[PDB]
Design an enzyme around this catalytic site. Structure first.
Site, short mmCIF file in Angstrom:
data_model
loop_
_atom_site.label_atom_id
_atom_site.label_comp_id
_atom_site.label_asym_id
_atom_site.label_seq_id
_atom_site.Cartn_x
_atom_site.Cartn_y
_atom_site.Cartn_z
N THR A 105 0.83 -1.20 0.00
CA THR A 105 0.00 0.00 0.00
C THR A 105 0.86 1.25 0.00
O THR A 105 1.56 1.53 0.97
CB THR A 105 -0.93 0.04 1.21
N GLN A 106 0.82 2.00 -1.10
CA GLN A 106 1.62 3.20 -1.20
C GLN A 106 0.90 4.39 -0.58
O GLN A 106 1.53 5.39 -0.22
CB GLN A 106 1.96 3.49 -2.66
N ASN A 107 -0.42 4.30 -0.43
CA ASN A 107 -1.26 5.41 0.03
C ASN A 107 -2.33 4.88 0.97
O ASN A 107 -3.25 4.17 0.54
CB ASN A 107 -1.89 6.12 -1.16
N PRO A 129 4.84 -1.92 1.20
CA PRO A 129 4.86 -2.08 2.66
C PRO A 129 3.50 -2.24 3.30
O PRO A 129 2.48 -1.90 2.69
CB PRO A 129 5.51 -0.78 3.13
N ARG A 152 -5.65 -3.90 -4.55
CA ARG A 152 -6.09 -2.57 -4.16
C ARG A 152 -5.35 -1.48 -4.94
O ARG A 152 -5.71 -0.31 -4.86
CB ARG A 152 -5.88 -2.36 -2.67
#
Lengths: 215, 240, 88, 191, 228, 238
Positions: free
Chosen positions: A1-3, A105, D91
């Site tokens: 998940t970057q955001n 991450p 996602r």
């Protein structure tokens, strides 16, 4: 998940004589919005350990699922052994770091607290793989707001009772309700002992607004 | 000759001999029975001690697949542990994926299709293991399934697997499934596990009992064999 | 071919003959445990259960010890039942 | 766009608008936002259209195959766990505003929410889409525990009337659906 | 009845390993002797005809600077183990900056003494003799096709193995010196060879801490044989 | 004997022969005896040599800081399950930062040696492990088999004529529980002196003794730290 999409907020925790009390708050937030009002950010792991988390909540449901399985594995061996919280902290570190090394991450900040062998344990795992042990851990803006009270008291008298520890977390959650924009006035206290893991209900704080008269 | 060796060859009378040899390989192993009551499933395995061999609690043929599902294996033992690991992993996949606890029907299908899946090739041999599956859930009830080495999975109120098989399932029709509480059914198993396998063949033996149902609140565990010790208190008084 | 149910009580009456047993009994447990047997094999099961009486020093025997001697010997005959397939 | 999902005693009530916005243009007035996965379980989708269509079709596949293989009615949480797995596992590309709702024989009425992040949480009443930000306040005050169905349909009717009224994206016509054991009743209101 | 290439015996062990042991018996002989000063070593080239050049035949190749070797049986099977065992010694030196000990070489070979099969063909048909001087002193080693690796103080192999061992325990003691052992080998060789012992039949190989290296040249052997 | 061919083929009696022939490969190895107290575990092996000049081939090999195993039978496969043994030790030592209990190690040996006993063209492992270590609940003495059936015993012995070792151990199993190390070890290798013919020693150059304890890390002694243990034993009877 970057955001991180739907985030949480600060988690507190402190040792005392015969256990570790950890109390987060039940808010989920989405940017500025406080969107989800009733979630549980504390997982009661089997008998002798306990988890809290900040940051992204979906990855916390992922580790809730994976730890939920991996405890049940050694539960169904039945040789008499179980995971010490020291052993869970190392796994959770090595699972955080091996996913860090691929630029994918888990956006979290977690506190593992547990009580085995008459030895209270309170560990920390950051997003980037930083892991250490301390008598008082605070995440997010807790490291900027509530950590000064914990390190204020633990330098004066390093051992604590259960009532002093439970009261001190209520004071720090009063502060984190005051000066944090993304913290809600509803929090749950969880405590491990030699008896077992116990999660208290959705308590509330009292506030002091007597400075509003001073224009 | 030549029709018994490989598993993938039909015999001219029309059956598969490697499967038939796999059926009577379990026939040499010791007797392990099971039965369900109206709110629980009681297991019992008679185990063999000749003189010294092992510490009490070695290689227990009662396993524990899920939180609410257990094994009772008989036959060759190593492949039974392999099926324990595979059924363990299948409960892990269903538990991880669909969010709720595994029903006993899907578990019987997904294991029995593997036991069947090793009877179609000469890459592998057919398994030589047969096992019980007991479980209880409040939206499900107590089910008891039976898997043979051929791959057939179906449902008993009570079953028996071993040498003394027919003699140990002769008496189960005397008992009543519908009315009895499982707390009676514990000693109601141990009386004939003590009765079957008479002591002229093997000098001594030792008993395991595992009990899942409503009283244990879904969790499957071994009963503390010392606690209530109801077995031999009735069993020494059951000879006359 | 093999007999049927409620016909098992028929072939039973003619296999009674010389061997007699206790007054209150039901023979259905006896013959049902042995299926696909020679008329003398079932006649052996009646005598084998009757030769267990002399070990019990009684004239008759309860049907619990009967089914024991009935089931054991019967299952021993089935392992020897191989080569029943015959060409047409 | 603006979706709605309220439960009550005998089941749940769903509701959505229809006006699907691409750019500053409306390429479709009236659209089936709520979708029949199974006979008792709906989802009403938000965000991107193609992503939620592919996800709803794939969940219909897996829940269909599993639901036949039990030969029993499926739980609602069985449907919600699959949206959690597909929305969470991918996602980085999907933008799914799914809200799963439906009556169940074993547990009664349930409403689960799935936002863009991929988490799953039960709510008594649920709201999504870009327009829901303008009816947060009204759905906070007007809601009260234990509403009957004739007040739930009125309640989601007004609750979508405000969002269609104020948001420029939302509009079109209100779609509704009431779900209980007696059968799904789908009707179209306006105003 | 060609059965499973990996099938056990009724005794029983591996059929094909037991068949592989008999392939050492028709190979040429060799003699190793452990000295307190070093390790001497002997072999016979077995010249087949005066057509052949005698010095191109290798029975001793030297693995590192400080670890000797001796091969037997089928030579073309041995060359693969030689060339890869050298790679394992160099990999030890380039991860570790130290000399690979004489022991761990034969673990690093005998861990793949048994790799035959169909998935994951035949076992090797060689019986090696490893010498060398590590920090533990001069070590003399011996490996088989089975991988059963053991230290041997004074090992013979091959066709002459029975008479060479049997005659060799009589003439060995704990405090052997080097030049005693060197002429103590060629007595056994000239008993066990079929051609006349001369400058073209055998080759010696010595490795010492203080006599190195000290490899293997001609005209030393001329002085060695003429001392008989 | 055409069904003695492969591991796939079942017998018409129900006994897969390749497993029986691999058990025969277990019996051909030398004797070794492992026996535990409540507070310690001791396993004692007996080396054999090829000739006089060759050194005796060792049996007991160090594995972890508390896990030690004996061996009988083949050697290369013992290095194979040895390397798998090390690797599955320091995997969980690397991940969980705790040592492994023994009772979940051996399931990896059973599930490791299982698959080469079922699929075609795979032999079983000629293997003779006598595993010993500490978990938190004390000592354990296990044994393995090429059929992968592991037994929690209080004392076993495998190898050549090891049944005499058992028939020694059964009349002292009531006394093999309380005693400490110095008589526990000689109680160990009395079984080894019954595994031999009664006309040759019982020397110092062959026996190897391994012990695992609480305040005592797993240790192998070799002829010279063994020489303080072999002193003071009873004579073999007439």
């Amino acid at each position: 998940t970057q955001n991180p999409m739907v985030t949480g907020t600060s988690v507190l925790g402190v040792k005392f004589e015969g256990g570790v009390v950890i109390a987060a708050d039940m808010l989920g937030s989405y940017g500025s919005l406080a969107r989800f009002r009733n979630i549980s950010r504390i997982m009661r792991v089997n008998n002798s350990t306990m988890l809290g988390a900040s940051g992204d909540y979906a990855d916390f449901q992922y580790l809730k699922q994976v730890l939920g399985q991996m405890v049940i594995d050694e539960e169904l061996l039945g040789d008499g052994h179980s995971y010490s919280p020291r052993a869970i902290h190392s796994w959770l570190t090595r699972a955080m770091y091996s996913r860090r090394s691929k630029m994918n991450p888990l956006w979290n900040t977690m506190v593992i607290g547990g009580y085995a062998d008459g030895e209270s344990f309170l560990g920390y795992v950051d997003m980037l793989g930083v892991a250490y042990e301390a008598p008082s851990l605070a995440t997010g803006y807790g490291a900027y707001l509530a950590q000064p009270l914990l390190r204020e008291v633990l330098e004066k008298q390093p051992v604590l009772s259960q009532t002093e520890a439970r009261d001190l977390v209520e004071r720090c959650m009063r502060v984190l309700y005051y000066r944090d924009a993304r913290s809600y006035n509803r929090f749950q206290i969880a405590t491990v002992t030699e008896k077992g893991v116990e999660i208290e209900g959705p308590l509330s704080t009292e506030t002091n607004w007597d400075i509003a008269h001073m224009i | 000759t030549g029709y018994d060796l490989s598993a993938s060859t039909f015999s001219p009378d029309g059956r598969v001999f490697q499967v038939e040899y796999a059926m009577k390989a379990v026939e040499n192993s010791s007797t392990a029975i099971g039965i369900r009551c109206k709110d629980g499933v009681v297991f019992g395995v008679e185990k063999l001690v000749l003189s010294k061999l092992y510490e009490e609690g070695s290689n227990k043929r009662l396993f524990n697949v899920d939180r609410h599902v257990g094994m009772a294996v008989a036959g060759l033992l190593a492949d039974a542990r392999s099926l324990a690991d595979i059924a363990r992993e299948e409960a892990s996949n269903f538990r991880s994926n669909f969010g709720y606890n595994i029903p006993l029907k899907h578990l019987a299908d997904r294991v029995a299709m593997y036991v069947h899946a090793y009877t179609l090739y000469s890459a592998v041999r057919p398994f030589g293991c047969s096992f019980m599956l007991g479980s209880y859930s409040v939206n499900d009830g107590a089910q008891l399934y039976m898997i043979d080495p051929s791959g057939v999975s179906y449902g008993y109120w009570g079953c028996a697997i071993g040498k003394a098989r027919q003699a140990a399932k002769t008496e189960i029709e005397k008992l009543q499934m519908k009315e009895m509480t499982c707390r009676d059914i514990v000693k109601e198993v141990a009386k004939i596990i003590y009765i079957v396998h008479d002591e002229v063949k093997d000098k001594a033996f030792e008993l395991e009992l595992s009990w899942v149902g409503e009283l244990t609140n879904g969790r499957h565990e071994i009963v503390p064999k010392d606690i209530r010790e109801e077995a031999e208190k009735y069993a020494k008084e059951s000879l006359k | 071919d093999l007999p049927n149910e409620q016909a098992r009580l028929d072939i039973l009456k003619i296999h009674a003959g010389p061997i007699t047993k206790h007054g209150e009994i039901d023979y259905e447990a006896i013959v049902k445990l042995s299926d696909g047997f020679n008329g003398a094999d079932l006649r052996n099961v009646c005598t084998e259960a009757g030769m267990f009486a002399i070990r019990a020093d009684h004239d008759f025997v309860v049907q619990e010890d009967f089914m024991k001697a009935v089931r054991k010997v019967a299952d021993s005959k089935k392992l020897e039942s191989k080569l029943d397939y015959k060409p047409v | 766009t603006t979706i709605m999902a309220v439960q009550f005693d005998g089941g749940v009530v769903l509701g959505a608008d229809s006006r699907t916005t691409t750019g500053s243009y409306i390429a479709n007035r009236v659209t089936d936002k709520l979708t029949p996965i199974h006979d008792r379980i709906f989802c009403c989708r938000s965000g991107s259209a193609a992503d939620t269509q592919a996800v709803a079709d794939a969940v219909t596949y897996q829940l269909g195959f599993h639901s036949i293989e039990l030969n029993e009615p499926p739980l609602v949480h069985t449907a919600a766990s699959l949206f959690k797995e597909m929305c969470y596992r991918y996602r980085e590309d999907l933008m799914a505003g799914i809200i799963i709702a439906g009556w169940d024989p074993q547990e009664g009425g349930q409403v689960y929410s799935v936002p863009m992040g991929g988490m799953m949480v039960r709510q008594s009443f649920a709201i999504g889409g870009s327009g829901s930000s303008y009816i947060y306040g009204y759905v906070d005050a007007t809601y009260r525990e234990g509403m009957t169905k004739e007040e739930c349909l009125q309640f989601t009717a007004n609750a979508l009337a405000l969002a269609m009224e104020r948001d420029g994206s939302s509009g079109g016509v209100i779609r509704l659906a009431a779900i209980a054991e007696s059968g799904v009743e789908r009707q179209v209101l306006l105003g | 009845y060609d059965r499973g290439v990996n099938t056990f015996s009724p005794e029983g062990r591996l059929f094909q390993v037991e068949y592989a042991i008999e392939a050492i018996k028709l190979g040429s002989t060799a003699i190793g002797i452990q000295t307190s000063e070093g390790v001497c070593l002997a072999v016979e080239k077995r010249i087949t005809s005066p057509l052949m050049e005698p010095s191109s035949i290798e029975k001793i190749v030297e693995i590192d600077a400080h670890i000797g070797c001796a091969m037997s049986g089928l030579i073309a099977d041995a060359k693969t183990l030689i060339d890869k065992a050298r790679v394992e010694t160099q990999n030890h030196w380039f991860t570790y900056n130290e000399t690979m000990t004489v022991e761990s070489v034969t673990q690093a070979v005998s861990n793949l003494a048994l790799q035959f099969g169909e998935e994951d063909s035949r076992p090797f048909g060689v019986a090696l003799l490893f010498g060398g001087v590590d920090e533990k002193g001069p070590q003399l080693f011996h490996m088989d096709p089975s991988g059963t690796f053991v230290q041997c103080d004074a090992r013979a192999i091959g066709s002459a193995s029975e008479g060479a061992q049997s005659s060799l325990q009589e003439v060995y003691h704990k405090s052997m010196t080097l030049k005693e052992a060197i002429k103590s080998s060629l007595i056994i060789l000239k008993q066990v060879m079929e051609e006349k012992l001369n400058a073209t039949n055998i080759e010696l190989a010595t490795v010492q801490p203080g006599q190195n290296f000290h490899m293997f040249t001609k005209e030393e052997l001329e002085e060695v044989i003429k001392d008989i | 004997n055409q069904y003695d061919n492969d591991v796939t083929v079942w017998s018409p009696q129900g006994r897969i022969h390749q497993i029986e022939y691999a058990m025969e490969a277990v019996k051909q190895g030398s004797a070794t005896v492992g026996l535990k107290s409540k507070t310690h575990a001791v396993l004692v092996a007996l080396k054999r040599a090829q000739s006089e000049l060759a050194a005796h081939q060792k049996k007991i090999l160090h594995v972890d800081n508390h896990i030690g195993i004996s061996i009988a039978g083949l050697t290369a496969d013992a290095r194979l399950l040895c390397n798998f043994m090390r690797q599955e030790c320091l995997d969980s030592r690397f991940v969980f930062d705790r040592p492994l209990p023994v009772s979940r190690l051996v399931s990896l040996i059973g599930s490791k040696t299982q698959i080469p006993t079922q699929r075609y063209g795979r032999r079983p492992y000629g293997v003779g492990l006598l595993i010993a270590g500490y978990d938190d609940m004390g000592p354990h003495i296990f044994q393995t088999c090429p059929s992968a059936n592991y037994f929690d015993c209080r004392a076993m012995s495998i190898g050549a004529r090891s049944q005499s070792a058992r028939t020694y151990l059964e009349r002292h199993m009531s006394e093999f529980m309380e005693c400490n190390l110095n008589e526990l070890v000689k109680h160990g290798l009395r079984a080894l002196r019954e595994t031999l013919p009664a006309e040759q020693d019982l020397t110092t150059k062959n026996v190897s003794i391994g012990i695992v304890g609480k305040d005592l890390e797993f240790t192998i002694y070799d002829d010279d730290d063994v020489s303080p243990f072999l002193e003071g034993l009873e004579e073999r009877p007439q």
